Structure 1
Amino acid sequence: GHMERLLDELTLEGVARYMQSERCRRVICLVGAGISTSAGIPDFRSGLYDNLEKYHLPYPEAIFEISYFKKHPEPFFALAKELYPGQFKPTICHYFMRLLKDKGLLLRCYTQNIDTLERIAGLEQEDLVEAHGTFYTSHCVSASCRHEYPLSWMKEKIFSEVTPKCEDCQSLVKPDIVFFGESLPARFFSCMQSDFLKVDLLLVMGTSLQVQPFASLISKAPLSTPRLLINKEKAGQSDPFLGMIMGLGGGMDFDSKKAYRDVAWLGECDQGCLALAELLGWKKELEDLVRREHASIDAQS
């Protein structure tokens, strides 16, 4: 009558032992804004509403709407200048994912971040699903053109306060982030199905699991696949699911007597990753990697 229990206990220690077993070959990370707050990028939960007042929008959410952007792009680009990070140093948490890549354990990193820090940390396009898009590239919005621009070009336009126009056709050029009204990227839909059939461990970091796609993505994992949340607070829990599909419905179950596969480690993402690395025997490798990669960035300033 009972599900296979791949974790020997619902703790970080049980997750580590499972990770070291033959059974754990494919890890998927789901990462959000919480993994970049220690890099100096605020998550807007400690808000945009104040930044937005000066632009005299019809309502605050108009800043996210693709239709409003196309008629009045100046507020977005002015906000983009205000919000542009002053440096791009990936965190311990990003480099933990680089370790997973280099050890052959990373099936995919799904991110809702647009800050490009995953790429800076050495994850490649094939490792990544940027689910809310990214600033890494931008495109001309004209359907017959679609000329691509790199972040260095977009940055210069943002900082010079020149509304970016396409060099081929003079249409607007928009960062490849997902504005409201736009579909999630094609990349997301082509990977999700296949990935979530093959996943042996789901690592969820720095997200409250309230926005799409992550809010529902956690439920696509096989029922036996363990799920570790590293976050400041619990996320993804709900009341016991009362509909047809029973245990397949609803979210994380950390605390009930039916709990069998989900673990919550509450604290800083960087500290959680370092604690997990330590259990795995990777703490020196991770510390060495962070030191060298941060130094490589510091050496170019």
Structure 2
Amino acid sequence: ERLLDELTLEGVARYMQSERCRRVICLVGAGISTSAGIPDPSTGLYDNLEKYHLPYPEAIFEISYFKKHPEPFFALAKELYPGQFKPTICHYFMRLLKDKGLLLRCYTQNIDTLERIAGLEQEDLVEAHGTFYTSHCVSASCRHEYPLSWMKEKIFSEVTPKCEDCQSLVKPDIVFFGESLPARFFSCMQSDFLKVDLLLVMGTSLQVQPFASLISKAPLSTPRLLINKEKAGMDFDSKKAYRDVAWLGECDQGCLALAELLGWKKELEDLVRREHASIDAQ
């Protein structure tokens, strides 16, 4: 019955080498980007906003307030926006899955675009909270699109981004409070998990819905691995535990350990130093 030899990282790895493990879905959150300097989340973000004199601290990420007073959001973005965008070991572990024909999807809660920087393409990605990768004019008759290079220079230069056709405000394609999740999230979830062979859940405690409910959409036999600072969301320990495995610690170290067990570690670390060097050159 059990598709896993044993509820360990080793059994996951062995399963990953069986003929039956063809289709892998990654579900990732803020914990896969912390080691890249991206924040988030009781990290204190809403605790430092007095200088923006907001009606309430969360207004800085609320769509209706943003459309009226975009300047706090874009000043906050400049302040928090990292000096470089270098994907983590964990990001490049997921690119190996893509490169070996194992990645069905990466569903991500993150907006930092590191999955794309690491080499995942749009077909590979479900950006459940949207992304800074692209931005759009907020006027419904226009919706002119702007790339990250454009939005980045506007934020760094402290120039409120305005549309070059109609002068309306231009917003990054991230999901603000008051906005709905992208259609791509709900459409892809309808069938992606009907026949997935493994769920890899990394850097999320599965406290956020409807993203957390994705893990219950897989077949009951599909093994599920959690790489996270804390156990949550799965049956690791009861008398009925049969398919869920928890590795507790930082996402990067967990991916390195999984890589070693598959014989992927050399290939992975060689991808990291290489890609990080290209980024420093730019």
TM-score normalized with structure 1 length: 0.91
How many residue pairs align between the two structures? Answer: 282
Check conservation: 2:137, 2:170, Cα contact below 8 A.
yes
Check conservation: 1:137, 1:148, Cα contact below 8 A.
yes
- Quote how far apart the aligned CAs of 1:41 are: 1.4
Check conservation: 1:51, 1:79, Cα contact below 8 A.
no
CA distance in 1, matches of 2:43, 2:74: 23
Matched, 1:294 2:242: no
Deviates more, 1:275-284 or 1:53-62: 53-62
Q: Deviations over 1:133-165 (max 9, x none)?
A: 000000001111110000111111111111111
CA distance in 2, matches of 1:283, 1:45: 33
Task: Provide closer, same or farther for how the CA distance between residues 55 and 143 of structure 1 changes in structure 2, counting only shifts above 3 A.
Answer: same
Partner secondary structure for residue 31 of structure 2: helix
Q: Deviations over 1:145-198 (max 9, x none)?
A: 110000111111111111111111111100000011111112112211111112
Check conservation: 2:46, 2:58, Cα contact below 8 A.
no
CA distance in 1, matches of 2:276, 2:44: 29
User: Which of 120, 132, 144 in structure 1 is aligned with 2:117?
Assistant: 120
Gaps of 5+ in 1: 236-250
- Quote how far apart the aligned CAs of 1:299 are: 2.1
CA distance in 2, matches of 1:198, 1:29: 14
- Quote how far apart the aligned CAs of 1:50 are: 2.6
TM-score normalized with structure 2 length: 0.97
Check conservation: 1:38, 1:91, Cα contact below 8 A.
yes
Q: Deviations over 1:26-78 (max 9, x none)?
A: 00000111111111112244511233221111111111211111111111111
CA distance in 2, matches of 1:27, 1:140: 36
Check conservation: 1:29, 1:109, Cα contact below 8 A.
yes
Q: How does 1:273-288 map to 2 (within 5 A)?
A: 273-288=255-270
Partner secondary structure for residue 100 of structure 1: helix
Deviates more, 1:97-106 or 1:177-186: 177-186
CA distance in 1, matches of 2:71, 2:4: 51
Structure 1 runs of 4+ with >6 Å offset: none
CA distance in 2, matches of 1:299, 1:81: 22
Check conservation: 1:204, 1:227, Cα contact below 8 A.
yes
Partner secondary structure for residue 142 of structure 1: coil
RMSD: 1.1
